[PDB]
PDB file of C-alpha atoms in Angstrom:
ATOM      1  CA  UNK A   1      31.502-102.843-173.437  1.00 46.63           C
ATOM      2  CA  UNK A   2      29.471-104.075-176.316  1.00 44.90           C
ATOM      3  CA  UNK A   3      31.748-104.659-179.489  1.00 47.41           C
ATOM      4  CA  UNK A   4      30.767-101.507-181.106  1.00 47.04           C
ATOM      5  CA  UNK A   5      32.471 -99.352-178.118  1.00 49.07           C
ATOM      6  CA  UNK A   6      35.470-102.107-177.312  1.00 48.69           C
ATOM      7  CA  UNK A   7      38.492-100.877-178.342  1.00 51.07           C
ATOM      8  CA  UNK A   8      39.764-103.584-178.921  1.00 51.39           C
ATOM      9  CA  UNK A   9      36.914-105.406-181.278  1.00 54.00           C
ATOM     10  CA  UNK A  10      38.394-105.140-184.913  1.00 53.05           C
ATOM     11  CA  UNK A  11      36.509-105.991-188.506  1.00 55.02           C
ATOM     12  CA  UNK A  12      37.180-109.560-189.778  1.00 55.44           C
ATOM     13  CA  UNK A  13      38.997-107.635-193.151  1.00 56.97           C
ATOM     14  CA  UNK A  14      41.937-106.062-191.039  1.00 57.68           C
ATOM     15  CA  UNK A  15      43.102-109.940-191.063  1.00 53.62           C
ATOM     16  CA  UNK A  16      44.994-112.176-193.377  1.00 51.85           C
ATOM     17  CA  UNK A  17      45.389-115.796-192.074  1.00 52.13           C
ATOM     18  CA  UNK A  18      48.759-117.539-193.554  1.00 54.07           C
ATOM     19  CA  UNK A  19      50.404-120.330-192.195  1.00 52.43           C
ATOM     20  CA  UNK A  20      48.712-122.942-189.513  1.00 51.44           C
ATOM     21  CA  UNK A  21      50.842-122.700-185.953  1.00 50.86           C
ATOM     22  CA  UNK A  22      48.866-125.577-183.967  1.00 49.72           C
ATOM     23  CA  UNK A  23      45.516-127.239-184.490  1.00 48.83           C
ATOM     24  CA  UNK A  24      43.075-128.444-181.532  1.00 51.05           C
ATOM     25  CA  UNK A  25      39.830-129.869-180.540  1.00 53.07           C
ATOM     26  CA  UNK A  26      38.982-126.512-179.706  1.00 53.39           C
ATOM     27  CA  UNK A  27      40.348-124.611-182.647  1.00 53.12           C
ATOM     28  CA  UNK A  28      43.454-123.578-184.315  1.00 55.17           C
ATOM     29  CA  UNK A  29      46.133-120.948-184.293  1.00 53.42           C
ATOM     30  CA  UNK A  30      47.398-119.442-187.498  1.00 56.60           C
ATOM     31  CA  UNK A  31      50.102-116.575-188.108  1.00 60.91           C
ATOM     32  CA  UNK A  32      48.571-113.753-189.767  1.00 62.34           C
ATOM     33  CA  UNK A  33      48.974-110.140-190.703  1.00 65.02           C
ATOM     34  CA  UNK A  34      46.558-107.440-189.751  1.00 64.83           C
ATOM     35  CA  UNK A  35      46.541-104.502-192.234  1.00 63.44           C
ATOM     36  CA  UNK A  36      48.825-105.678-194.342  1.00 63.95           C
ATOM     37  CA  UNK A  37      51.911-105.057-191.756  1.00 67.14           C
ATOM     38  CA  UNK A  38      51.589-106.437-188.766  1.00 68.65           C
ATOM     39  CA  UNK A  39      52.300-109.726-187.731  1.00 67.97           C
ATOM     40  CA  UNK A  40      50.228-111.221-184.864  1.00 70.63           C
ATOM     41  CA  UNK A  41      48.748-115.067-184.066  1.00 69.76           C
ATOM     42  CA  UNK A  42      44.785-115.659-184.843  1.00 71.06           C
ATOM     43  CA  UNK A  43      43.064-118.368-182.345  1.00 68.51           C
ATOM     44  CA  UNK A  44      40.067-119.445-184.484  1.00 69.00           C
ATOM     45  CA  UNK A  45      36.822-120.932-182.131  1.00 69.96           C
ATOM     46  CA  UNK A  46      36.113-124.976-183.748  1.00 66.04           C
ATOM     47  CA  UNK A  47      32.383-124.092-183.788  1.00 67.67           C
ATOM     48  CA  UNK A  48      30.610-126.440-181.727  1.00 69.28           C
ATOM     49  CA  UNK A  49      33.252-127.858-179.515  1.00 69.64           C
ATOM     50  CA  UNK A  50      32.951-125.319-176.685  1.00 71.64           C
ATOM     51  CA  UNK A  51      31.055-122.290-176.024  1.00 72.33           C
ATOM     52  CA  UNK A  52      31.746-119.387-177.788  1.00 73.61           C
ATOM     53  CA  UNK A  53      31.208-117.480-174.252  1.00 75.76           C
ATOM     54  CA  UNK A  54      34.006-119.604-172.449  1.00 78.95           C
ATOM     55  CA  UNK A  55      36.231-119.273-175.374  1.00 80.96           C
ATOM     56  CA  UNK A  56      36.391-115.482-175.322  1.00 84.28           C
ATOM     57  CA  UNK A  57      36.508-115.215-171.353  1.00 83.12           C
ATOM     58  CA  UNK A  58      40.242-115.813-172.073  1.00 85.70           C
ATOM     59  CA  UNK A  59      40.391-112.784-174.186  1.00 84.33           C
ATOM     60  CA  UNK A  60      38.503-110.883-171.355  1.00 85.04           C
ATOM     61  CA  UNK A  61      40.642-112.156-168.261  1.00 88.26           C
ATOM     62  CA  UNK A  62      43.658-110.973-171.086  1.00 85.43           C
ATOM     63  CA  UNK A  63      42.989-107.560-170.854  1.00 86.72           C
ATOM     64  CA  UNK A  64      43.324-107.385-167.275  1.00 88.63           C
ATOM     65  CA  UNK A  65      46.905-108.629-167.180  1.00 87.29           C
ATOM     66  CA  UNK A  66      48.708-106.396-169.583  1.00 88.83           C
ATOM     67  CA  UNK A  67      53.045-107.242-168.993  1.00 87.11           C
ATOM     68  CA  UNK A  68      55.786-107.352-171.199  1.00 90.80           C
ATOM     69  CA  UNK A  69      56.082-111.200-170.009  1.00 90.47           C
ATOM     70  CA  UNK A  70      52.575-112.100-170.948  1.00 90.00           C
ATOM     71  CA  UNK A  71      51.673-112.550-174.474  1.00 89.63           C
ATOM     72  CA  UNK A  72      49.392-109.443-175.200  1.00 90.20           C
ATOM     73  CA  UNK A  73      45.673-109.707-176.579  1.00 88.86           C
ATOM     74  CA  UNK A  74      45.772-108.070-179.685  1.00 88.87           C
ATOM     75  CA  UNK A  75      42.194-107.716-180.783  1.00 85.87           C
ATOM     76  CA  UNK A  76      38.859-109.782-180.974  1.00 84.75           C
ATOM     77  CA  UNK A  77      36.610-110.748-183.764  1.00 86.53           C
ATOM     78  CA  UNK A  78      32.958-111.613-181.646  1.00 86.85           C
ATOM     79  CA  UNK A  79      30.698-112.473-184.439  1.00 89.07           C
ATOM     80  CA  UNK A  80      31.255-115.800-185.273  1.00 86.84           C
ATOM     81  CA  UNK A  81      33.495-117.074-186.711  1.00 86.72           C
ATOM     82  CA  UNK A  82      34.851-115.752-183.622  1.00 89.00           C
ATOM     83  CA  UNK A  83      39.356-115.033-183.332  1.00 88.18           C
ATOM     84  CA  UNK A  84      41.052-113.776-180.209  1.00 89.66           C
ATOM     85  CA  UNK A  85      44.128-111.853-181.733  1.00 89.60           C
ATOM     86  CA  UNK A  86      47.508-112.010-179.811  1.00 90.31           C
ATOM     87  CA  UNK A  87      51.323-110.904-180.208  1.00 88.39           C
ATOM     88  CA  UNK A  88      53.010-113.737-182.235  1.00 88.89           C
ATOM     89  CA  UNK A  89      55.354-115.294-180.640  1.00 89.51           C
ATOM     90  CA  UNK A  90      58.184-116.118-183.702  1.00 94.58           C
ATOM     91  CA  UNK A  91      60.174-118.908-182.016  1.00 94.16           C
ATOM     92  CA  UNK A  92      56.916-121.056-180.474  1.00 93.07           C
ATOM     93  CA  UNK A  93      56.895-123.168-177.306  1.00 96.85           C
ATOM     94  CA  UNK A  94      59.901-123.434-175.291  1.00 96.13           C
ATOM     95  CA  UNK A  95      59.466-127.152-174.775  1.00 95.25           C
ATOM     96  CA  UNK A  96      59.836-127.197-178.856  1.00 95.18           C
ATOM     97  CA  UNK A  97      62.353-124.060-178.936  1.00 92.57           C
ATOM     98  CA  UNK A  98      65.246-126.054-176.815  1.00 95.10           C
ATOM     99  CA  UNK A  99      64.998-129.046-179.430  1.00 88.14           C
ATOM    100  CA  UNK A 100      66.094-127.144-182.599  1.00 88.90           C
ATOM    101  CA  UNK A 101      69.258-126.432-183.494  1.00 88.49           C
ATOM    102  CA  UNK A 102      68.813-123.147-182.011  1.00 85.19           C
ATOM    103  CA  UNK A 103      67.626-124.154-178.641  1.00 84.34           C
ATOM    104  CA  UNK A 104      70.318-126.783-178.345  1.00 86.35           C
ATOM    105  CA  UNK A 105      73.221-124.376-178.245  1.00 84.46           C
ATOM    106  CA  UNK A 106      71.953-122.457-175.490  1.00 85.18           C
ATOM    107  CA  UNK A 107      74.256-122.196-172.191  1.00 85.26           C
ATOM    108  CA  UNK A 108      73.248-122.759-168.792  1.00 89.53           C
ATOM    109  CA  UNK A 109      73.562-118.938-168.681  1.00 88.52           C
ATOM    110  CA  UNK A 110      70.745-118.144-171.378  1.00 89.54           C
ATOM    111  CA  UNK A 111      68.543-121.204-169.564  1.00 89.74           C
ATOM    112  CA  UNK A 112      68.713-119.555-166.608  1.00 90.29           C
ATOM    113  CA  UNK A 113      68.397-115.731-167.970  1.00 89.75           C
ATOM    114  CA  UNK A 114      65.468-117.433-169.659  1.00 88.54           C
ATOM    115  CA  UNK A 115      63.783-119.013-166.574  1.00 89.04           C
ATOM    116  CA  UNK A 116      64.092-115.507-164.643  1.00 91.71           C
ATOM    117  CA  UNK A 117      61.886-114.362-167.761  1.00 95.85           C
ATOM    118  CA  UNK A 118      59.249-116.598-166.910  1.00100.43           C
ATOM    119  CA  UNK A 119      59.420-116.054-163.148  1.00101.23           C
ATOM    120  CA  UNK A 120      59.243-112.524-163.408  1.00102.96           C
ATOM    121  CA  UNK A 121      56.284-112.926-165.796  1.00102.63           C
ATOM    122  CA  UNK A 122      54.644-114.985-162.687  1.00101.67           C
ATOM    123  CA  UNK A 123      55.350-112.328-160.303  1.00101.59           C
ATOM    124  CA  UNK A 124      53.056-109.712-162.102  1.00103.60           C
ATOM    125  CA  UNK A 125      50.329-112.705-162.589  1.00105.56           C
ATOM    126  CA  UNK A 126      50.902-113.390-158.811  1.00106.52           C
ATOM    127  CA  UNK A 127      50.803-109.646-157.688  1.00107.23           C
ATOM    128  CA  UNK A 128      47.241-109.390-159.590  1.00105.47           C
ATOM    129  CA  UNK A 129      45.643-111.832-157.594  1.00106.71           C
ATOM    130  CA  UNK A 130      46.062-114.620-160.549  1.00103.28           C
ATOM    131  CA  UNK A 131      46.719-117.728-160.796  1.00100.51           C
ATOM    132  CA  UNK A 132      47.709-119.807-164.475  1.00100.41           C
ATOM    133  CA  UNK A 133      47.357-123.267-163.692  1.00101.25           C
ATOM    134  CA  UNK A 134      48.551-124.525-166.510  1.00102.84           C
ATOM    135  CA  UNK A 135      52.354-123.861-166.620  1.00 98.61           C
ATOM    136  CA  UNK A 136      54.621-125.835-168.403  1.00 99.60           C
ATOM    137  CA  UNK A 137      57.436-125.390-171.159  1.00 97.64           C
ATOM    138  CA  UNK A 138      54.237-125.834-173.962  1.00 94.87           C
ATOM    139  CA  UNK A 139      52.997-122.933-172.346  1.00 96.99           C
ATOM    140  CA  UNK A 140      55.846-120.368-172.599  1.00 97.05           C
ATOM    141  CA  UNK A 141      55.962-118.999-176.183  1.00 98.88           C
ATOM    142  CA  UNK A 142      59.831-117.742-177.154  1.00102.21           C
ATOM    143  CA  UNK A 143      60.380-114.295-179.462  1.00105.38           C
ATOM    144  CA  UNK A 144      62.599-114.195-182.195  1.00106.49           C
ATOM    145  CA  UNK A 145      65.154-112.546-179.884  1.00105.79           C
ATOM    146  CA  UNK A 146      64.937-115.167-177.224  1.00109.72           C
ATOM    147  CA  UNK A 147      62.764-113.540-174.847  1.00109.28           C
ATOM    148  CA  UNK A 148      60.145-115.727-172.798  1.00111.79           C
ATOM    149  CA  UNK A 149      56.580-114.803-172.735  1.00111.50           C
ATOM    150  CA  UNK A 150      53.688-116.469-170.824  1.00108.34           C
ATOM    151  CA  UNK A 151      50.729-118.033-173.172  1.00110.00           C
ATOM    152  CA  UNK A 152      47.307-119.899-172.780  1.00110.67           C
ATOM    153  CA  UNK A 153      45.273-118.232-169.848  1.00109.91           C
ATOM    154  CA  UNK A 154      42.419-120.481-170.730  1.00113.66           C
ATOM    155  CA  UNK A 155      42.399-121.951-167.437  1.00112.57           C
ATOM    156  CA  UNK A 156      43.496-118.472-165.522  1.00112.76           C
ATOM    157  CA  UNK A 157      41.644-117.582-162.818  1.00109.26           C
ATOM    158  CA  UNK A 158      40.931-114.149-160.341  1.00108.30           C
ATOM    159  CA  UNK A 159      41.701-115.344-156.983  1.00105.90           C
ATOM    160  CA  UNK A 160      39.145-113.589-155.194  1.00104.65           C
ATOM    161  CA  UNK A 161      39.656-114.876-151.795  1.00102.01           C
ATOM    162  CA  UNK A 162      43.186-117.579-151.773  1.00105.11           C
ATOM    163  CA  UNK A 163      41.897-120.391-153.689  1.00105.70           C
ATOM    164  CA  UNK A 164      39.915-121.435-156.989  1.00108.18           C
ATOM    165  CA  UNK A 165      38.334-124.659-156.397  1.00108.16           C
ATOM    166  CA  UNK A 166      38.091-126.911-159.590  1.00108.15           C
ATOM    167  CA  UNK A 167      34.779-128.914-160.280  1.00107.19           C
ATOM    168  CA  UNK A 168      34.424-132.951-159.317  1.00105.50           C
ATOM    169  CA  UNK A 169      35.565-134.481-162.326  1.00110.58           C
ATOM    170  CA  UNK A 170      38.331-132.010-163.374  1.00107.50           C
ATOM    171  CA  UNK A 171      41.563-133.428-164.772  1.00110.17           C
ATOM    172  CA  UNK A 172      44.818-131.984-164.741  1.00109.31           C
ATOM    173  CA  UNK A 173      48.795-132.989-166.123  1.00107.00           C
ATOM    174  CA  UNK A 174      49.858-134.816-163.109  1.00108.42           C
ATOM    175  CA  UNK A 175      53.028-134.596-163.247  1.00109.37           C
ATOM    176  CA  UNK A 176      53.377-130.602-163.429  1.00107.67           C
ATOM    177  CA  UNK A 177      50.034-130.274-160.861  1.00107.31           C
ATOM    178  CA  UNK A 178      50.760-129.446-157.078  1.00110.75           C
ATOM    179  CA  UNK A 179      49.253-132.425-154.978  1.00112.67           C
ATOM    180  CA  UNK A 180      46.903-130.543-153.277  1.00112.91           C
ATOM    181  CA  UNK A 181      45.205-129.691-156.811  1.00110.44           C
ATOM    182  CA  UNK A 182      45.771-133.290-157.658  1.00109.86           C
ATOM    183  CA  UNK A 183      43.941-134.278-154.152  1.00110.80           C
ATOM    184  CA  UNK A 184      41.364-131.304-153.523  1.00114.38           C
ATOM    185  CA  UNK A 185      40.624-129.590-156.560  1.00114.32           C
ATOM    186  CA  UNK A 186      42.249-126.573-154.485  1.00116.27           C
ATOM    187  CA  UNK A 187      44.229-123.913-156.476  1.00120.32           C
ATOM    188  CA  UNK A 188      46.229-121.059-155.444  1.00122.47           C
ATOM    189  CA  UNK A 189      49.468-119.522-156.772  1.00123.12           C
ATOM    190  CA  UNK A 190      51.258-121.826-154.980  1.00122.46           C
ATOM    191  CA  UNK A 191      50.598-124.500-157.139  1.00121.62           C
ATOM    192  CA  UNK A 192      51.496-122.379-159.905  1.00122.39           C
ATOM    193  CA  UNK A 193      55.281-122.238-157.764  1.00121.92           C
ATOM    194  CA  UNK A 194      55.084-125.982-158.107  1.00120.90           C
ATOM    195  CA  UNK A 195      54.344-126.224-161.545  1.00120.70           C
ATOM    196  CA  UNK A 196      57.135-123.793-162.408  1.00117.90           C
ATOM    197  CA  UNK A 197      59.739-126.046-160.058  1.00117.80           C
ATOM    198  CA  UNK A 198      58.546-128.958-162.568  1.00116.58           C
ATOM    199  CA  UNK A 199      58.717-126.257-165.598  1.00115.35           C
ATOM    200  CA  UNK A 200      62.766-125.781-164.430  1.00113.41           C
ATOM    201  CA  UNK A 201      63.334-129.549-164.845  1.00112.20           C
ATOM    202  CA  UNK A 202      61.715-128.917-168.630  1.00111.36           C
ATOM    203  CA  UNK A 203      64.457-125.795-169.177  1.00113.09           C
ATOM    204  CA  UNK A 204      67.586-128.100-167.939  1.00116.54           C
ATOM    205  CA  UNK A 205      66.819-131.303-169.778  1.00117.15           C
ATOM    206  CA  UNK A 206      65.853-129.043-173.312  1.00117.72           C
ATOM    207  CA  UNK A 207      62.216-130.394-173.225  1.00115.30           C
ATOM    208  CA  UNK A 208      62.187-134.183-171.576  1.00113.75           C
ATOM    209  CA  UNK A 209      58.990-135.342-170.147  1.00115.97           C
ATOM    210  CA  UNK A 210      59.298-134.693-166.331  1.00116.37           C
ATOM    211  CA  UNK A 211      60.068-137.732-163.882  1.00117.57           C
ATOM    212  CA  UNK A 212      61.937-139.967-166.376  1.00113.30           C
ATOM    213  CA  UNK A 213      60.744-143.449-166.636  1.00115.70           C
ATOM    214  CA  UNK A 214      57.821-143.384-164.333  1.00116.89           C
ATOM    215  CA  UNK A 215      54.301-142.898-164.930  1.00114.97           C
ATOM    216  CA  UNK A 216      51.315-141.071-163.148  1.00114.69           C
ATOM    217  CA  UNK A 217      50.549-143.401-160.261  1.00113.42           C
ATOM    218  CA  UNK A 218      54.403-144.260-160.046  1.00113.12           C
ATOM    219  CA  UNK A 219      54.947-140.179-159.371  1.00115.53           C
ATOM    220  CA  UNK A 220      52.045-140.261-157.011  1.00116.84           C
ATOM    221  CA  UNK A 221      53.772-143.212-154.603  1.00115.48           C
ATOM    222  CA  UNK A 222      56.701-141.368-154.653  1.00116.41           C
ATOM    223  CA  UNK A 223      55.674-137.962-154.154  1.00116.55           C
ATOM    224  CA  UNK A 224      53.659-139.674-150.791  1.00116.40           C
ATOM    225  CA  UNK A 225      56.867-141.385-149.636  1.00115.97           C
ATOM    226  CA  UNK A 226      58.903-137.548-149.549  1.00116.04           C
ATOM    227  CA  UNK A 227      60.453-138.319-152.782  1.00116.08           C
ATOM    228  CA  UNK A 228      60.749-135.253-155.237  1.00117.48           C
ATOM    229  CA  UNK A 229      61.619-136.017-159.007  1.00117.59           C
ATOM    230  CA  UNK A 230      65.626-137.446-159.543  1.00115.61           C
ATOM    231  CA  UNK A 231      68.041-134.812-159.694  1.00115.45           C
ATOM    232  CA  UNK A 232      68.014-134.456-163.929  1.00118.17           C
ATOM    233  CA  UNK A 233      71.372-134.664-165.886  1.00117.25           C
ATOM    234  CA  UNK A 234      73.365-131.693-166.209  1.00115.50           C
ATOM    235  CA  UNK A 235      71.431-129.849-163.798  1.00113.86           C
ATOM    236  CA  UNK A 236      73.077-127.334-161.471  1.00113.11           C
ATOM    237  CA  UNK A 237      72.859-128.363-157.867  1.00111.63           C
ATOM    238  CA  UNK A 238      71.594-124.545-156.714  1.00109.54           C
ATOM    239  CA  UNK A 239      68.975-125.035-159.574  1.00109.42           C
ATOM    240  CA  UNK A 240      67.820-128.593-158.448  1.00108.69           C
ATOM    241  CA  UNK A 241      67.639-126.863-154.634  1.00109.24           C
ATOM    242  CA  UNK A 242      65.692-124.149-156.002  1.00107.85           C
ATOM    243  CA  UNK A 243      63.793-126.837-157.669  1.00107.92           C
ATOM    244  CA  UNK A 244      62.886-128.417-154.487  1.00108.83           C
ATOM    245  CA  UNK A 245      61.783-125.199-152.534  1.00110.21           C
ATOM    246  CA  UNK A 246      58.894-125.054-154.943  1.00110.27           C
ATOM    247  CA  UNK A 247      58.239-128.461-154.101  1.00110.70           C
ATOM    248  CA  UNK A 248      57.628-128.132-150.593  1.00108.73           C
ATOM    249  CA  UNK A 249      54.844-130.140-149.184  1.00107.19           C
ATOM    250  CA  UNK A 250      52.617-127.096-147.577  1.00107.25           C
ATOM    251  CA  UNK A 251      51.927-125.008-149.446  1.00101.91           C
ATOM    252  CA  UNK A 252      52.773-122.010-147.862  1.00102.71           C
ATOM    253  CA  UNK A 253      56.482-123.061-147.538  1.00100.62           C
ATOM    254  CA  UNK A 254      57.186-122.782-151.163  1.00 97.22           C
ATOM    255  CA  UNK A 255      58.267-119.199-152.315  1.00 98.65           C
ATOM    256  CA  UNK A 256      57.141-116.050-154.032  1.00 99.76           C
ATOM    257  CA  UNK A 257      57.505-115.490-157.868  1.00100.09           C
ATOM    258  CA  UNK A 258      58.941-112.639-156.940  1.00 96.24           C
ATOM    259  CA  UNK A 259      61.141-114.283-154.697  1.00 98.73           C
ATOM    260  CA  UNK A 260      62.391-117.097-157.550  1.00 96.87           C
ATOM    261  CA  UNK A 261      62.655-114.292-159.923  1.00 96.00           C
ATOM    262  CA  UNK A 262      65.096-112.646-157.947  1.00 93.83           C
ATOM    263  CA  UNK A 263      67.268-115.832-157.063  1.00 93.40           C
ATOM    264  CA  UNK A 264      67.135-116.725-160.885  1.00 92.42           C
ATOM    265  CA  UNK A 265      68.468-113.334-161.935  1.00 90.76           C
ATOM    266  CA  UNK A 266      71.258-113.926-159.062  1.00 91.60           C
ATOM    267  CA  UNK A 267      72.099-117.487-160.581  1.00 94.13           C
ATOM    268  CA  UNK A 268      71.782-115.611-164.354  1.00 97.38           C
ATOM    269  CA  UNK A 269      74.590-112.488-163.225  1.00 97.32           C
ATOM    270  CA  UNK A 270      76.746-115.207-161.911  1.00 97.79           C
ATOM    271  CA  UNK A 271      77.104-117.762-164.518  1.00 94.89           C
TER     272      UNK A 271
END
């Protein structure tokens, strides 16, 4: 629908930019009010560093999964400069979140109620026919009552048929990408289960980087030999197992969202 017929296109005025929340090649994100009252996070477009198209496909692909676990699109701004308006998130990333003071205190218990969160915020991407491909800890934005949200669908894709092929040269994380999207390019929302295994080990340690002490090609050798990353400290041996079944090697082995989310929730109403 062209802007003046999209409900959700709103005039640049309604917004009040205040306080920078992270800054980028391709922009920034700043906490801001619109009309006065409402507070909500503005993603500003760096003009010139990427296409003003591709940024607001995000915003467009947003739309389509509307959940309680996914950080809602709020409203767009098209005419440049151009701001994709979301639900502000007050507490930030998790990976930063389970640093502070705050996020330090947290039992097992709320770790694991929080990881169900995210899981069941994966089901509803995975019953849509999506895929994320970018989850981590950065990538999980926490409310100011300590609820988990999914963020940055930049590199979300529909899953027409069961796989999104990346281009030739893509690069992604290596250490939170499932080999066969490492290997082939090949994505499917089973790599997404393996990313979220790898997420777990971000939840238990309160933010470490993932495989301790090794580096990419390091993780590689081992993940060829049948190793999977070290058990982490103070990790629950039913988490660690539950770990490892997303970190099968086919990829059709590893489970459901909806099938983690449930387990989680089990783990959750018994600790």
């Amino acid at each position: 629908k062209p802007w003046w017929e999209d409900a959700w296109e709103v005039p640049r005025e309604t917004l009040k930019l205040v306080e920078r929340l992270g800054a980028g090649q391709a922009g920034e994100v700043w906490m801001g009010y619109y009309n006065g009252h409402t507070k909500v996070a503005v993603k500003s477009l760096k003009q010139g560093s990427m296409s003003p198209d591709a940024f607001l496909a995000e915003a467009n692909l947003m739309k389509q999964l509307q959940h309680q676990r996914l950080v809602r699109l709020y409203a767009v701004v098209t005419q440049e400069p151009i701001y994709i308006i979301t639900e502000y998130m007050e507490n930030g990333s998790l990976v930063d979140f389970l640093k502070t003071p705050s996020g330090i205190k947290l039992t097992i218990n709320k770790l694991l109620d929080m990881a169900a969160q995210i899981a069941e915020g994966m089901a509803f991407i995975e019953e849509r026919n999506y895929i994320h491909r970018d989850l981590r800890a950065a990538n999980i934005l926490v409310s100011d009552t300590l609820s988990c949200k999914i963020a940055d669908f930049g590199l979300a894709r529909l899953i027409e048929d069961a796989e999104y092929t990346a281009r030739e040269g893509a690069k992604f994380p290596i250490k939170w990408t499932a080999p066969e999207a490492i290997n082939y390019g090949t994505f499917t929302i089973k790599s997404d289960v393996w990313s979220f295994g790898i997420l777990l080990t971000e939840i238990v340690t309160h933010g470490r980087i993932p495989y301790p002490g090794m580096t990419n090609p390091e993780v590689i050798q081992n993940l060829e030999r049948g190793y999977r990353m070290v058990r982490p400290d103070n990790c629950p041996e039913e988490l660690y197992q539950l770990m490892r079944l997303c970190w099968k090697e086919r990829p059709e082995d590893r489970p459901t969202f909806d099938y983690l989310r449930s387990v989680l929730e089990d783990f959750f109403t018994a600790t």
